[PDB]
Amino acid sequence: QFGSTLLSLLERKDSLSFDAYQMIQSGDLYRFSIDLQQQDIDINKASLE
Amino acid sequence: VSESYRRRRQEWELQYKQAEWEVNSVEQQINLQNMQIKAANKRLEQVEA
Lengths: 49, 49
What we know:
The structure is cut from a larger assembly and holds 2 copies of chain A. The first copy, chain A, is mostly helical. Chain A is 84% helix and 0% strand. The first copy, chain A, has helices spanning 2-21, 27-37, 39-48. The relative contact order of chain A is 0.07. It is classed as toxin.
């Protein structure tokens, strides 16, 4: 009972640590998305000129 | 002939200055292309990331 308690809790521990690390994977992608797209304001201004 | 030689210059006066101002207008279209060259580079690096 103690060994299966330790094992089944350790699956619950190492499952949720994956769900955590999977979120921060978005942080670089937002930076690159904004710093690519923002130029279309400068192109829409250059087209008005 | 004295009127005709006076009328003649005006056709070449217009033809050079309109062409000179289209030489001015084309300069915007070549300067605009830097933005899509930057966009294509800022696109490709995201697939690698």
